[PDB]
Amino acid sequence: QTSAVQQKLAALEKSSGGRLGVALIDTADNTQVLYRGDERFPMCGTSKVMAAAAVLKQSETQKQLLNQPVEIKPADLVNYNPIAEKHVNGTMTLAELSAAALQYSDNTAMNKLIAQLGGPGGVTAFARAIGDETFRLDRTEPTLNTAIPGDPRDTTTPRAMAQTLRQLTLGHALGETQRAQLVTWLKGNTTGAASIRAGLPTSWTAGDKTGSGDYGTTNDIAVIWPQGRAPLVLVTYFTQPQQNAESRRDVLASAARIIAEGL
Ligand SMILES: CO/N=C(\C(=O)N[C@@H]1C(=O)N2C(C(=O)O)=C(COC(C)=O)CS[C@H]12)c1csc(N)n1
Ligand SMILES: CO/N=C(\C(=O)N[C@@H]1C(=O)N2C(C(=O)O)=C(COC(C)=O)CS[C@H]12)c1csc(N)n1
Numbered sequence: 479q480t481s482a483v484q485q486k487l488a489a490l491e492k493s494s495g496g497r498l499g500v501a502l503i504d505t506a507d508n509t510q511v512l513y514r515g516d517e518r519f520p521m522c523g524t525s526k527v528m529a530a531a532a533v534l535k536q537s538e539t540q541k542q543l544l545n546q547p548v549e550i551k552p553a554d555l556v557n558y559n560p561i562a563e564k565h566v567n568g569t570m571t572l573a574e575l576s577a578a579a580l581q582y583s584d585n586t587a588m589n590k591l592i593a594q595l596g597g598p599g600g601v602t603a604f605a606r607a608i609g610d611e612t613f614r615l616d617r618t619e620p621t622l623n624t625a626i627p628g629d630p631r632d633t634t635t636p637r638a639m640a641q642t643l644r645q646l647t648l649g650h651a652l653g654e655t656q657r658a659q660l661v662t663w664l665k666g667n668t669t670g671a672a673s674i675r676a677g678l679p680t681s682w683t684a685g686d687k688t689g690s691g692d693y694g695t696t697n698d699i700a701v702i703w704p705q706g707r708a709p710l711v712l713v714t715y716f717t718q719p720q721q722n723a724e725s726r727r728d729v730l731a732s733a734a735r736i737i738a739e740g741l
Pocket of ligand 1: 523693
């Protein structure tokens with residue numbers, strides 16, 4: 479079948495010139511709205527949530543892990559290091575690296591999270607451990623953001639990512655203290671105002687993690703607390719056919735607005 483919201487998302491996609499994937503979970507009744515919900519999309523920076531969560535999980539059995547210093551060398555710097563660049567020849571704790579990766583989308587910080595987990599496969603193993611059989615991280619930063627059409631590397635589906643984000647932020651995939659830390663980090667994101675959040679009623683609160691890459695790949699995943707109602711989880715992925723396509727955060731905002739209006 480095809481619902482009204484699904485029809486509106488289809489119209490948005492057609493006018494956009496790209497491919498749109500959406501997954502909503504409304505925890506008020508556990509109902510879902512999917513659009514290309516089982517198609518694979520490049521995650522880009524949205525994968526940073528899985529890496530941070532995996533390190534939080536490790537910290538459950540090490541009350542001091544988040545305070546562990548990690549050396550940042552000049553050679554470690556990649557293509558987007560707004561926080562790490564200030565700490566070259568110094569150190570950052572895993573908590574600092576998690577906050578930098580999530581709230582500033584720092585790619586060098588993400589690489590340190592991946593390294594702590596033993597490589598991209600370590601992040602994938604954590605995803606499997608919490609019931610996500612779809613997610614796959616294959617590369618480090620920044621090549622995990624190449625976003626080449628058809629490439630299965632570093633992809634997931636909207637359905638899978640929404641279910642996992644729910645488990646992490648609203649469920650029991652993490653311990654209570656760790657879940658609160660993850661939510662606090664997401665709510666403090668600095669990069670998300672033009673994406674999902676731009677399509678929501680002003681009064682609503684949210685935590686999100688953006689992603690972007692080649693092929694005008696423009697992503698966002700969010701946990702939303704609408705004013706006076708049970709939280710939602712929303713994933714919006716978008717990618718385009720030309721390598722040099724422009725970013726389209728307005729498409730994500732439009733998708734979120736359609737979703738919000740349809741509740
Ligand atoms: C080889 O890697 N290529 C990247 C890339 O590093 N994407 C990563 C990603 O996701 N990040 C986000 C992100 O979270 O969206 C921002 C956020 O940007 C700002 C200013 O907030 C900065 S770029 C980084 C890329 C990005 S766009 C494009 N053509 N390529
Ligand atoms: C000359 O371009 N250099 C880029 C680059 O491709 N940036 C692109 C661009 O502008 N985009 C926008 C944008 O148009 O605003 C956003 C905004 O947020 C999202 C989600 O797209 C994310 S980055 C992407 C780059 C990537 S990493 C690095 N150090 N430089």
